[PDB]
Amino acid sequence: TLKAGQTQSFNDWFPDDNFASEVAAAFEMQATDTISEEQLATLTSLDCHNSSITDMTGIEKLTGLTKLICTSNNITTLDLSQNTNLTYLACDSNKLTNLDVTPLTKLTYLNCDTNKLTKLDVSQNPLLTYLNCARNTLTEIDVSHNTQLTELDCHLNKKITKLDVTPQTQLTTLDCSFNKITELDVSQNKLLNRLNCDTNNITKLDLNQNIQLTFLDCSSNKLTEIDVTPLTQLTYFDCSVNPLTELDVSTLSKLTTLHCIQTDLLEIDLTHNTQLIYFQAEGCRKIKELDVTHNTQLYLLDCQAAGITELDLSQNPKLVYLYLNNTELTELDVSHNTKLKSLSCVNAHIQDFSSVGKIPALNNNFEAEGQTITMPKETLTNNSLTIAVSPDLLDQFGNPMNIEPGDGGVYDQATNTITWENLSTDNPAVTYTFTSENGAIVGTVTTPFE
């Protein structure tokens, strides 16, 4: 017997006006048109995203539904106990404090991202392939019964301390970022391709079995060491904000992006990463040498704070963005880097900036303030001292710079010397600032005495 049931307006079926109105449009009808229980049951798919819906009461009557999208609404509860034919559920960006999916035994896609869930029970969903409980307030997530899971996103729950994916042998994408995870065993996830476990408390990460990762981000963790040598397919690798002291990327022939910001590395060998486009290594304070000569397609180089006294940029024609601020450089040469839109080398120990004027786009977009130069000491003669202003002090266009002595001292332009009167061994040095006429370059030259 196929019973018709009651026949009434969508507005009478669905108390929420905005919901009734969306269910109506699903049948290409108005909210005030009448429809039967048997008619309502024929709808296999519903999309009411971004509709100002607070209440989904009446959903129990749409029993033919295999797909429900209610994203970007104000829904505080969703009783889906009668919608047992659902295979796809997107209820993300709502105000759900709880969500029961235990009756939905045919469910293969579940997205409840950005809600207020404290528990989530997916143990009755054995066909699950996409679970996304991102941006909830969960403390754990048992996926032990969900063996067909290909993608898991439990990022930004904040309180997750344990994650077990040892049974998820089909996992290709994992995002467990911004939690308190301390151990991640990914050795059974042989098909893994994308891994993001950043912003956790992971101390060890064994990736030896995951030899077909293409994307890896283990940044902001507590990794003392890591072995990426087996991961020959990697194109993007990010291990920033870890206390790693040694990193071996020689096997990563396909690497395009390497981020190792704020790591403790003593050295780094980029010579085999011929395809490298982005190397971002700001705060790699222990590095004292950088050979980017084999990285011929480098588009952006950032090694701020690095202890490099020089940097051979001859082989990097494609460079558009270079960041050398806070380095130990005493020499700069960007003449072969004609694509540069932005150069920055604040707080270095540079004198001659003449190579930068070779690139006219840099005439304006150029910062080189806070230079700190240190000269060999002289002896006094009477209570006085004359010195030659360093000839290497040359600006962007190879012109002299303006000399402002740490004044008791008179700069003589003719002779390009400074003479201070009344100097004391109590205060054992003399200084002068230099500034370029465009104001892009500023520094000091300390000269000790006696």
Ligand SMILES: [Cl-]
């Ligand atoms: Cl009505």
